[PDB]
Amino acid sequence: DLRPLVPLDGGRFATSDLNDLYRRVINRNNRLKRLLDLAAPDIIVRNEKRMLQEAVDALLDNGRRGRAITGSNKRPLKSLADMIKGKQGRFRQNLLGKR
Amino acid sequence: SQLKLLVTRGKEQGYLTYAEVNDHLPEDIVDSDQIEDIIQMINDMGIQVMEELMLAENTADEDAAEAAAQVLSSVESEIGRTTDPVRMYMREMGTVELLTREGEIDIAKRIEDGINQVQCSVAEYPEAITYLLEQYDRVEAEEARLSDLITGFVDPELAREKFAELRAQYVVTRDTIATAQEEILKLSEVFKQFRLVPKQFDYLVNSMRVMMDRVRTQERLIMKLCVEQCKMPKKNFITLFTGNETSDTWFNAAIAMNKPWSEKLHDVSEEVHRALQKLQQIEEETGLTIEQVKDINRRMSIGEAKARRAKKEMVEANLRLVISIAKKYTNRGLQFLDLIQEGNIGLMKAVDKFEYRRGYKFSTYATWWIRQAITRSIADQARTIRIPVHMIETINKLNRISRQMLQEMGREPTPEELAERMLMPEDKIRKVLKIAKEPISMETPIGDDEDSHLGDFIEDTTLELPLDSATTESLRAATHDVLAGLTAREAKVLRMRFGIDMNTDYTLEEVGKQFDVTRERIRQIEAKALRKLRHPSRSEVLRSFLDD
Amino acid sequence: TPEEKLLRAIFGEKASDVKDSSLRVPNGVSGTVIDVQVFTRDGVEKDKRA
Amino acid sequence: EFDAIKIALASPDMIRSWSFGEVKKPETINYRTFK
Amino acid sequence: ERMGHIELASPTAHIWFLKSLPSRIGLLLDMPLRDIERVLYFESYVVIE
Amino acid sequence: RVKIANRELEANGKVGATYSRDLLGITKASLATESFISAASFQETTRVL
Description:
The structure is cut from a larger assembly and holds four copies of chain A, one copy of chain B and one copy of chain C. Chain A is mainly alpha-helical. Chain A is about 45% helix and about 5% strand. In chain A, β1 (about 5) and β2 form a beta hairpin. The longest helix of chain A has 20 residues, at about 15-35. Chain A is globular, with a radius of gyration of 17 Å. Chain C has one helix spanning about 5-10. Chain C starts with a helix and ends in a 40-residue tail after the last helix. Chains in contact: A-B, A-D, A-E, A-F, B-C, B-D, B-E, B-F, D-E. The interface of D and E includes residues 18 and 22 of D. It is classed as transcription/dna.
């Protein structure tokens, strides 16, 4: 209920980007588990570990190591760090002055 | 370096514009990504960069200032420093040789011998052949599918007689345990003409691995008790333990050594005798010695590693192949590297299923498997609300018959028209085209004044309004009043029958057991009380809670 | 819930299986209804007033 | 009610103690019955 | 209020403690930043005793 | 801090610290704040946390 997926008018849901980021971390983590239990060619395993690291960093603070990913609609997905910081964040805009 | 003068220039002026940053860069910095990252360095420290009363603030810093300055001084020499995944992978994939022009068949022969070494290694094992005769008898005695043991060979009934023949040969091999060596070679050469089911073979291999693990664990129980606790000496334990491996002299005639260490193993003496009897007993549980099956699975792991160290090479080449193939879906809602990873996994899949026997070139078939697995993973993990793969295929054929029906019929498809041209019942097509659309992001920038987002207007349909909680506490008070106007019979039985000011509302029998009366009396009492409550002077206050 | 339960079991007014979500005039607005337009999905029975 | 706000890193055992269960699959909900 | 946890099959550096400038990981080990991010992405190896 | 410490030492028999008063700008006198909640409020939050 902090990263909710809510039914809109017309059945087209609405989701916060944290679901995208958690999903990208979870797929890559499951694939790393898969490749580890296949004895895969270790260059592919290196790539999986690198991608999982990049995913965890997009999840923790997007646009802090490389370029913001991505988003699905061509705008930088916001992550937990974006949920805290920023003029339009959480410490400022509903924490100090609220409706 | 020159960027040092650039940083001090920005600090002098109090800013830095894109012109000066484009000037003062390391000339052969051809990488726009490290360009962006180095300007993000010079900005993340502060000064702030721009492109053209500039009195706001500094924000930083004496701690991160020298940090970013150090990173800049280093990055002045950062030659091969792309530092992003998609380019690092391309680097380390093109760096490896593309040494594959019908050397695939040589690699395949390597695998062929390596997979036959594991075959002969297992097939030299007595208890596994016992397991195989077991499963021939069970699969022909209806324990599983009739071919649930073998993947063909180099025919139900002559095959059952073949397996009876193999059973006779192996059981006489067991009968003639020197004399046993020639008969086990008989065993090996007579099984060498067969071919098992890879699942049964897999359990075979895993049982060999459990053999290895348990034998090494009893190795640990022998050694660590003295070789790791009493500090049993290394080379003497070597030349005595391995070299004897059977008799009591390795331990019973070694406790009589009275050495500085043989005066240390009387503690574990009976424990290592348990280990000795377990050695000889597991030799029975396997049928043959520990050394024999040990070196058996050793050479088998040799052959398996020999096979694996060639699939590595061909997956290198064919992973260049996969980066080739994958680029047709860069805008399918999935990351490019994730596409390449699914293609790599499918490539290993096809490499273990590629065959030279058809004489087909590798690429056309591995790309078959790769397109399969990549479209699979796209259909699987490209959408938050997972629709199954068949639904994705159905929406795809709907879309493909939609562009066609648009370019032909001029105006637009419609569910009537689509149920015409497609073979669906005019309503599941409705739900399909309802399903296809993506959840809009809850951080969509709304067209408002406050920089508002779509997540700020999503109201709450589960909350009960505080007029509707103070219209329930008022009701609780009203019912407690109107029940107080009543005997303990009616009050207790109504609080108990319903959930009023109590835990779970009981049925009639529980109320009766609390009142020691039968259920029909309870029904009469509660009906009496409700009758009493129905009239005004007991109903006016409750009824005002009914706006109906 | 409870005692709401008892207040519906006393006066016997059933719990309707339908929720009210009708379109009503805003608060403060007061004007004649000068028009009504009804659109329907294709292949759905038009009511008496459509 | 509560005095000062303490802060630190998070031990993996502490992060396992926060959680009420692992998350193994990337599934949000069903597409027909939205449970 | 309930939280979950994903069990990373491989470790993963906290980007806050690798790009905090100074890198807390980096300045704790006294290993400069580019060396850390070069052992990170498997560009190199680092001995450990 | 130095005021209270060297004052309670002056009450003692030990020589206090000879301080020298600095002078900062408002956007740096605010940067140094005891409570990390407020500091995360009006500063770079990632650095503060």
